[model samples]
Target chain A: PADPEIVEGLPIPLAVAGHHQPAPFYLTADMFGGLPVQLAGGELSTLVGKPVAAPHTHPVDELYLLVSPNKGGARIEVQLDGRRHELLSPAVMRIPAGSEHCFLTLEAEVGSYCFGILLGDRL
Target chain B: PADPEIVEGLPIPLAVAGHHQPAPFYLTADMFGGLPVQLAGGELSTLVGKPVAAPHTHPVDELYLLVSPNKGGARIEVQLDGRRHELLSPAVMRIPAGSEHCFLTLEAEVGSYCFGILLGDRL
Candidate 1:
């Protein structure tokens, strides 16, 4: 029998692209899992040498979390609805439904990472 | 104007306990910030010296994401509905509605962190 207490998985599948590697952590909604939310993201580093994802739009709202692990912080560039904005680590960006957006990791400390949680299931 | 683009905040207010700091990133639902979901968590280290939270219950379902930033991984212990389970980093735990749960940072690498997304607003 499936464990009644734990979710029983290390990293769930999530659709992503670019040099970013999906974090081994995620919760999917009914369409994927039975959870009421969908969450995913992965580590970022200079080694990637490119943007983590290409420009994309979602049918539902999405939140981007850029986190830095040290005093050096992280440097990230994001394009939202065709406007470009640069952000330092420890930041949060909300892409309203239908807003076209993409992000690149310019520079990040050894432990910096980014992730996003969508308001809906895979799309 | 509220930037018409970004969420505009570093660390949003979240109700958390023990030694776990609220992540500098979060998205709240209607009762909080008009978003469709609520997400939050923070870095974990031995500096805290205790469980991240005390045993607690929530009216909504919550998903716990335990992430490790390196090969060394993270060590965590979680109590769900009165049972205890140990987990390494890059793990996901689902807490069903009204289920009692609590977790602790036993040991973690420098960049390890934990966060949760609730299906409902602050309780």
Candidate 2:
């Protein structure tokens, strides 16, 4: 599902802290020609979600890799298995394939941001 | 070539980076079960290189993803199609399949660090 044409570059959207007006960005295999894994997000905040299933699993494993990449100022809480883990900006943690997982919260006084890689087949 | 056992967590090594005694870290599929793509780097520096091919192409496509995931302070110069482009930390760019590419320099005054995802088949 990679794009037929070459993509020049993608800049993380400028996001205001503490605002819930924006949506998290998704990078797809459609953009990269079915390159196996999909990359997503330039931000993480209460603004980024209405909450998906908690303690869920993916067919393939995943890495919650970075909290903030450009201008670091956010922290995140991720629910793995059943424990809640707090990760400050710039970290790597794997969500094993078929294990239940979910984003618990984004702890930024103003707003927060994050980026990560999704691993699996047919991605 | 991913490690068969599940890995708990990997902290980006605390690097002063410019000192050059340290080396760039490589993440292999062996670390993730021959996953289609391998993730690498917690740092990118003059210390990170002995220099691979300049503007070289891979059999499959690859992406030089993040310059720094945590504690951002470095910028990178990259060679794309024989031209030079400077990218500050926390950006995304694709090294198209079979296209020549390489790192030009690490632009941090003291030191620099970076992270990226490598896309390919049989990685």
Candidate 3:
């Protein structure tokens, strides 16, 4: 018999990584590389676990979507200089080039997934 | 001059914590501690960044809600012994015990959130 494949537990920790962040807010440098990072080393990726809020403005815009397992789902709270907006799943979001925001997940061990595409537009 | 309150950014990373997991799947243990954690320090918290897929079985059931900041959302794919079930935000879910699943996030830097409560029932 062979050992069981435990591919989905806490992969890396916080210390060895230089900083202790919940989610390494996806960055442009991350896009320069591949994904599924160890959380400690290398750059951040959108496909990475959890989420990170950022004020890093991009030249272009982007769109992202989310879904849940079982029936459980999550919430999103965006704050632009105190202005807040919220939305759930089965939905779509358009992020402008210059904006500051944050996000997080709710529950359902089922886990969840999201898809995002970079958008280009002139403000 | 004031240093400033940088409250909205990546809270914690993967290493230094222990395991290098992208998202630390919200767990029964997490809900126990109360909110946002340092990712690598405490037992674990749902409010913590990222997500981890767990195969935990409970005698009762539970409910979780999700939302997005700008409209961006996530996906949920439930795998019950090979069967898959997926749900997005702006929706609700009723999870039964004895199930295996996994999930992830998309993008936007908009971040996201989820609200969950334990449920009860008989198999």
Estimate every model's Cα lDDT from 0 to 1: 0.68, 0.51, 0.33
**Model 1: residues with Cα > 4 Å off, grouped in runs:** A1-4, A14-25, A30-33, A46-48, B15-25, B30-33
Q: For residues B1-123, what per-residue lDDT tens digits would candidate 3 score against the true structure?
A: 221221112222322121245432322222222222111111112323344444434344433333443333433443444554443533234344444433333321323444332332221
Docking class of 1: medium
* lDDT of candidate 3 at residue A113, scale 0 to 100: 41
Model 2 CA lDDT for position A58: 63
What does candidate 1 score on TM?
A: 0.83
Top lDDT model? 1
TM-score to true structure, per model: 0.83, 0.56, 0.29
Worst 10 contiguous positions by lDDT, candidate 2 chain A:
A16-25
lDDT of 1 by residue, A14-84 (tens): 55543255533366665235655466777786534576567777777777778867743777788987888
Q: lDDT rank, highest first?
A: 1, 2, 3
- Better structure of 1 and 2 per DockQ: 1
Summarize candidate 2's per-residue lDDT along B1-123 as a digit string, tens digits.
332333334432323223233323334555555556655554334444444333455666667654332334556667777876666655555777666676644554222444456675432
Off by over 4 Å in 2: A1-23, A42-59, A66-77, A85-91, A104-114, A121-123, B1-23, B42-57, B66-75, B86-90, B105-114, B121-123
lDDT of 3 by residue, A1-123 (tens): 221221112112222111236431221112213221111111122323344444334444434434433222534444443555543533334455555544444332323444332332221
For model 2 the local lDDT of residue A45 reads: 39
Q: Residue B116 error for model 1, in Å?
A: 1.2
